[PDB]
Amino acid sequence: MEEIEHRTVEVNGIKMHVAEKGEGPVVLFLHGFPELWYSWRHQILALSSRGYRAVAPDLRGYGDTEAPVSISSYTGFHIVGDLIALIDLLGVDQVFLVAHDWGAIIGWYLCTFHPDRVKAYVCLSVPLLHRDPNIRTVDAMRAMYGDDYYICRFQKPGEMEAQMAEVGTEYVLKNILTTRKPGPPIFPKGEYGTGFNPDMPNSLPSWLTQDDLAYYVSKYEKTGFTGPLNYYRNMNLNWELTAPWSGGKIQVPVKFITGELDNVYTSLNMKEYIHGGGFKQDVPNLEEVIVQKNVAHFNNQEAAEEINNHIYDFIKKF
C-alpha cells in the first residue's frame, strides 16, 4: 500500500485524487457508495503485482476528490466526463474496466457512450439498469417499495445527511458495511435508526479491519455524505437525459459478479433480469454470471481474492 502512488489531477474542471500502482494494460476501478478508492486496495495490489496498471480514483464528490456544490453536477454525464478525461491523461486508447455499485452504474454509462474505450468490463453488484420508457427510475422504486425505501429516502437534499449525523459517521459506515440482510433496504420512518442492518455484529467481520473502518471514517467525518448521496438525486434526471439510448444494447464483453446476499441482487426484480435472459439480451457479450455464495454486497472486499482471480482470468482472455 506504501507503494501505491497518490496524486491529484485536473480532469473535466475538477481536482481528482487518483491512486495508481503498476505498469501494463490499464485496469480502471470505479468504487461505489459510500466508499472510496480504498475499497479496491486488494485488487490494486494484486493486479499491479500480476503485471497490470491498476488505477483507482476517488470519484467526483468522494474522498480526496473535489465535490461540486450543485446537485445537478452529479449526473452520469458529469461523472463519465471526468473519467474520459482521466483515461486520456493515462495515455491509453482502451482500458479494462472494473466497477462496483454506483461505480458500476457509471461504468455502464461509460460503456454506453464510449464502448471503444473499454476492452472488457468486470461488473460487480449492479447489472445494466434497463431504461423503462414508461416510468422514471425513482418513480418505479417508489411504487414498488414505498417512501422509506433507501433510494427514496436519499432524495430530499439534506435529510439523510442530518439523520446520519444524529447516529454518527462510524455508526453509519459500520451499519452499511456489515449488512448481510437480503432484500430491499427499508429504513425506519423518520430517522436513520437501524438503517441497513438491524443485526450489527460487535466485532467487524474478518474482511474488514479496525484500521480499514477508521480510514473510511477519517474521510467521511470531514467531507460528509452529500457528494456521494447526490448521485442518487440525479437518477430521475439521468433517466430523462438518457432517452437517446432507449432500447440500446451494449457490445462490450462483460463478466458480472455478485454476492448472493447483496441487497441489489435480492430486490428490484434483479435476479430475474440477471438470469432470465433480459441481461444477456441487452448485453450480448455477457459471459457466465457469477453468484458468490454466502457473500454480501461488498464482494470486492469480502471475497477480495476471488475477485482478484475473476478479474485476472477474464482480462487475460483479451
Coordinates of C-alpha atoms in Angstrom, one line a residue:
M1 CA 0.0 0.0 0.0
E2 CA 3.0 2.1 0.6
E3 CA 4.0 1.8 -3.0
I4 CA 0.6 2.9 -4.3
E5 CA 1.2 6.3 -5.8
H6 CA -1.3 9.0 -4.9
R7 CA -1.7 12.1 -7.0
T8 CA -4.2 14.9 -7.8
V9 CA -5.0 15.5 -11.4
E10 CA -7.2 18.1 -13.2
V11 CA -9.9 16.4 -15.2
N12 CA -13.1 17.9 -16.6
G13 CA -12.8 21.1 -14.5
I14 CA -12.4 19.3 -11.1
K15 CA -9.4 18.1 -9.0
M16 CA -9.4 14.3 -8.8
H17 CA -7.5 12.1 -6.4
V18 CA -6.0 9.1 -8.3
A19 CA -4.4 6.0 -6.7
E20 CA -2.2 4.0 -9.0
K21 CA 0.2 1.1 -9.0
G22 CA 1.9 -1.0 -11.6
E23 CA 2.6 -1.0 -15.4
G24 CA 0.8 -2.8 -18.2
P25 CA -2.7 -2.6 -19.6
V26 CA -4.8 -0.2 -17.5
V27 CA -7.3 -1.7 -15.2
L28 CA -9.6 1.2 -14.1
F29 CA -11.5 0.6 -10.9
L30 CA -14.7 2.5 -10.0
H31 CA -15.9 2.4 -6.4
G32 CA -19.4 2.7 -5.1
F33 CA -21.4 4.1 -2.2
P34 CA -20.4 5.1 0.4
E35 CA -16.9 4.0 -0.4
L36 CA -13.6 5.3 -1.7
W37 CA -10.6 4.3 -3.9
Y38 CA -9.6 2.3 -0.8
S39 CA -12.3 -0.2 -1.4
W40 CA -10.1 -1.6 -4.2
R41 CA -7.0 -1.9 -2.1
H42 CA -6.7 -5.6 -2.5
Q43 CA -7.3 -5.5 -6.3
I44 CA -4.8 -2.7 -6.7
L45 CA -2.1 -4.7 -5.1
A46 CA -3.0 -8.0 -6.8
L47 CA -3.5 -6.7 -10.4
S48 CA -0.4 -4.5 -10.2
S49 CA 1.7 -7.4 -9.0
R50 CA 0.3 -9.5 -11.8
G51 CA 1.5 -7.1 -14.5
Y52 CA -1.3 -4.6 -14.9
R53 CA -1.5 -0.8 -14.3
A54 CA -4.1 -0.5 -11.5
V55 CA -5.9 2.9 -11.5
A56 CA -8.5 3.7 -8.8
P57 CA -9.8 7.3 -8.4
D58 CA -12.0 8.8 -5.8
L59 CA -15.0 9.6 -7.9
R60 CA -16.5 13.2 -8.1
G61 CA -17.8 14.1 -4.6
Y62 CA -15.8 11.4 -2.7
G63 CA -12.8 11.2 -0.5
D64 CA -9.9 13.5 -1.8
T65 CA -11.7 14.4 -5.0
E66 CA -13.5 17.7 -5.5
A67 CA -17.2 17.8 -4.5
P68 CA -19.1 20.4 -6.6
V69 CA -21.9 22.1 -4.7
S70 CA -24.7 21.8 -7.2
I71 CA -26.8 18.7 -7.0
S72 CA -27.0 18.7 -10.7
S73 CA -23.3 18.4 -11.1
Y74 CA -23.6 14.7 -10.3
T75 CA -25.5 13.3 -13.4
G76 CA -24.0 10.3 -15.1
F77 CA -22.7 12.5 -17.8
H78 CA -20.6 14.6 -15.4
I79 CA -19.0 11.5 -13.9
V80 CA -18.3 9.9 -17.3
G81 CA -16.9 13.3 -18.4
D82 CA -14.4 13.1 -15.5
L83 CA -13.4 9.5 -16.4
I84 CA -12.9 10.1 -20.2
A85 CA -10.6 13.0 -19.2
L86 CA -8.8 10.6 -16.8
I87 CA -8.4 7.9 -19.4
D88 CA -6.9 10.5 -21.8
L89 CA -4.5 11.6 -19.1
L90 CA -3.4 7.9 -18.6
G91 CA -2.4 8.0 -22.3
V92 CA -4.3 4.9 -23.5
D93 CA -6.9 4.2 -26.1
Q94 CA -8.6 1.5 -24.1
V95 CA -8.9 0.2 -20.6
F96 CA -10.1 -2.8 -18.7
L97 CA -13.0 -1.6 -16.6
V98 CA -13.8 -2.9 -13.1
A99 CA -16.7 -1.4 -11.1
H100 CA -19.0 -1.9 -8.2
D101 CA -22.3 -0.4 -7.0
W102 CA -22.6 3.3 -8.1
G103 CA -19.3 2.9 -9.9
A104 CA -20.8 0.1 -11.9
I105 CA -23.8 2.3 -12.9
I106 CA -21.2 4.9 -14.1
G107 CA -19.3 2.1 -15.8
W108 CA -22.5 1.1 -17.7
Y109 CA -22.8 4.7 -18.9
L110 CA -19.1 4.7 -20.0
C111 CA -19.8 1.5 -22.0
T112 CA -22.9 3.1 -23.5
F113 CA -21.3 6.3 -24.7
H114 CA -17.7 5.1 -25.4
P115 CA -17.6 1.3 -25.9
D116 CA -14.5 1.7 -28.0
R117 CA -12.6 2.9 -24.9
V118 CA -13.4 -0.3 -23.0
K119 CA -11.8 -3.6 -23.9
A120 CA -13.8 -5.6 -21.4
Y121 CA -15.8 -4.9 -18.2
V122 CA -15.9 -6.8 -14.9
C123 CA -19.1 -5.6 -13.3
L124 CA -19.8 -6.1 -9.6
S125 CA -23.2 -5.9 -7.9
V126 CA -25.2 -3.7 -10.2
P127 CA -26.1 -5.0 -13.7
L128 CA -27.3 -2.9 -16.6
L129 CA -30.3 -0.8 -15.4
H130 CA -32.8 -1.1 -18.3
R131 CA -34.4 2.2 -19.1
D132 CA -38.1 1.7 -18.9
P133 CA -39.7 4.3 -21.1
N134 CA -43.0 4.0 -19.2
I135 CA -41.7 5.1 -15.8
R136 CA -38.8 7.1 -14.3
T137 CA -36.2 5.2 -12.3
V138 CA -37.1 6.5 -8.8
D139 CA -40.8 6.6 -9.5
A140 CA -40.7 2.9 -10.1
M141 CA -38.8 2.2 -6.9
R142 CA -41.3 4.3 -5.0
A143 CA -44.2 2.4 -6.5
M144 CA -42.6 -0.9 -5.6
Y145 CA -41.2 -0.3 -2.2
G146 CA -42.6 3.0 -0.9
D147 CA -41.2 6.2 0.5
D148 CA -38.9 4.5 3.2
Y149 CA -37.0 2.5 0.6
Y150 CA -33.4 3.8 0.9
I151 CA -33.1 5.3 -2.5
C152 CA -36.3 7.3 -2.0
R153 CA -35.1 8.5 1.4
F154 CA -31.9 9.6 -0.2
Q155 CA -33.7 12.0 -2.5
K156 CA -34.5 15.1 -0.3
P157 CA -31.4 17.3 0.0
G158 CA -30.0 17.4 3.5
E159 CA -32.5 15.0 5.1
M160 CA -30.4 11.8 5.1
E161 CA -27.3 13.8 5.9
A162 CA -28.9 15.0 9.1
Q163 CA -30.3 11.6 10.0
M164 CA -26.8 10.1 9.5
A165 CA -25.3 13.0 11.6
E166 CA -27.5 12.1 14.6
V167 CA -26.2 8.5 14.8
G168 CA -22.6 9.3 13.7
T169 CA -20.3 8.6 10.8
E170 CA -18.7 5.5 12.3
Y171 CA -22.1 4.0 13.1
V172 CA -23.4 4.7 9.6
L173 CA -20.3 3.2 7.9
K174 CA -20.3 0.1 10.1
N175 CA -24.1 -0.2 9.7
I176 CA -23.7 -0.3 5.9
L177 CA -20.5 -2.3 5.5
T178 CA -21.6 -5.1 7.9
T179 CA -25.0 -5.6 6.4
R180 CA -25.9 -9.2 5.4
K181 CA -29.6 -8.8 5.2
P182 CA -31.1 -9.7 1.8
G183 CA -33.9 -7.7 0.2
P184 CA -34.8 -4.1 -0.4
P185 CA -33.4 -1.8 2.4
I186 CA -36.4 -0.1 4.0
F187 CA -35.5 2.5 6.6
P188 CA -37.4 3.1 9.8
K189 CA -39.7 6.1 9.5
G190 CA -38.2 9.5 10.3
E191 CA -34.7 8.6 11.4
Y192 CA -31.7 6.5 10.5
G193 CA -32.2 4.1 13.3
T194 CA -31.2 0.5 12.4
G195 CA -30.7 1.7 8.8
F196 CA -29.5 -1.1 6.6
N197 CA -28.7 -3.6 9.4
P198 CA -30.8 -4.3 12.4
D199 CA -28.4 -7.1 13.4
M200 CA -25.0 -5.3 13.7
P201 CA -22.2 -7.5 15.0
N202 CA -20.0 -6.5 17.9
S203 CA -16.8 -7.3 16.0
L204 CA -16.2 -6.3 12.5
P205 CA -16.4 -9.2 10.1
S206 CA -12.9 -10.7 9.3
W207 CA -12.6 -9.0 5.9
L208 CA -12.8 -5.5 7.5
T209 CA -10.1 -4.4 9.9
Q210 CA -10.5 -1.7 12.6
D211 CA -7.9 0.3 10.6
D212 CA -9.9 -0.2 7.4
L213 CA -13.1 1.2 9.0
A214 CA -11.1 4.0 10.6
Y215 CA -9.7 5.1 7.2
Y216 CA -13.2 5.3 5.7
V217 CA -14.4 7.3 8.9
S218 CA -11.4 9.7 8.6
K219 CA -12.7 10.9 5.2
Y220 CA -16.5 10.8 5.8
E221 CA -16.3 12.5 9.1
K222 CA -14.8 15.5 7.4
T223 CA -16.4 15.7 3.9
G224 CA -19.7 14.1 4.7
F225 CA -22.2 12.2 2.7
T226 CA -23.6 14.9 0.4
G227 CA -21.4 14.4 -2.7
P228 CA -22.0 10.6 -2.7
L229 CA -25.7 11.0 -2.0
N230 CA -26.1 13.4 -4.9
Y231 CA -25.6 10.6 -7.4
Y232 CA -28.9 9.1 -6.2
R233 CA -30.5 12.6 -6.5
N234 CA -29.9 12.6 -10.3
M235 CA -31.4 9.2 -11.1
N236 CA -34.6 10.7 -12.5
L237 CA -32.6 13.3 -14.4
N238 CA -30.3 10.6 -15.7
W239 CA -33.4 8.8 -16.9
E240 CA -34.6 11.9 -18.8
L241 CA -31.2 12.6 -20.3
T242 CA -30.6 9.0 -21.5
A243 CA -33.7 8.9 -23.8
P244 CA -31.3 8.9 -26.9
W245 CA -30.1 5.4 -25.9
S246 CA -33.5 3.9 -25.2
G247 CA -33.6 0.3 -26.3
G248 CA -29.9 0.2 -26.8
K249 CA -27.5 -2.8 -26.4
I250 CA -24.0 -2.8 -25.0
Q251 CA -21.5 -4.8 -27.1
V252 CA -18.6 -4.6 -24.6
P253 CA -17.6 -8.0 -23.2
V254 CA -18.8 -8.3 -19.6
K255 CA -18.3 -10.6 -16.7
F256 CA -20.9 -9.9 -14.0
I257 CA -20.3 -11.0 -10.3
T258 CA -22.5 -10.5 -7.3
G259 CA -22.6 -11.7 -3.7
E260 CA -25.7 -13.9 -3.3
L261 CA -26.9 -11.8 -0.3
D262 CA -26.4 -8.4 -1.9
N263 CA -29.5 -6.3 -1.4
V264 CA -29.3 -5.4 -5.1
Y265 CA -29.4 -9.0 -6.3
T266 CA -32.2 -9.8 -3.9
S267 CA -34.5 -6.8 -4.8
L268 CA -35.9 -4.8 -7.8
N269 CA -36.6 -8.0 -9.8
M270 CA -32.8 -8.1 -10.4
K271 CA -32.4 -11.8 -10.0
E272 CA -34.9 -12.4 -12.8
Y273 CA -33.3 -9.9 -15.1
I274 CA -29.8 -11.3 -14.5
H275 CA -30.6 -15.0 -15.1
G276 CA -33.8 -14.8 -17.0
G277 CA -32.5 -13.7 -20.4
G278 CA -33.0 -10.0 -20.2
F279 CA -29.5 -9.1 -19.1
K280 CA -28.0 -11.3 -21.9
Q281 CA -30.3 -9.8 -24.5
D282 CA -29.2 -6.2 -23.6
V283 CA -25.6 -7.3 -23.2
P284 CA -24.9 -9.9 -26.0
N285 CA -21.2 -10.5 -25.0
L286 CA -22.1 -11.1 -21.3
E287 CA -20.2 -14.2 -20.0
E288 CA -21.4 -16.6 -17.3
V289 CA -22.7 -14.7 -14.4
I290 CA -21.0 -15.5 -11.1
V291 CA -23.0 -15.7 -7.8
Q292 CA -20.8 -15.8 -4.8
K293 CA -22.4 -18.0 -2.1
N294 CA -22.6 -16.5 1.4
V295 CA -21.2 -13.2 0.3
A296 CA -22.8 -9.8 0.8
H297 CA -22.8 -6.6 -1.2
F298 CA -19.2 -5.6 -0.7
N299 CA -17.8 -8.5 -2.6
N300 CA -14.6 -6.9 -3.7
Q301 CA -13.6 -6.7 -0.1
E302 CA -15.4 -9.7 1.5
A303 CA -14.3 -12.1 -1.3
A304 CA -11.3 -10.0 -2.4
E305 CA -9.1 -12.8 -3.6
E306 CA -11.9 -14.5 -5.6
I307 CA -12.5 -11.1 -7.2
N308 CA -8.8 -10.7 -8.0
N309 CA -8.9 -14.1 -9.7
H310 CA -12.0 -13.5 -11.6
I311 CA -10.7 -10.2 -12.9
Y312 CA -7.3 -11.7 -13.9
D313 CA -8.8 -14.7 -15.6
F314 CA -11.2 -12.6 -17.6
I315 CA -8.9 -9.8 -18.8
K316 CA -6.1 -12.3 -19.8
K317 CA -8.5 -13.6 -22.5
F318 CA -8.1 -10.3 -24.3

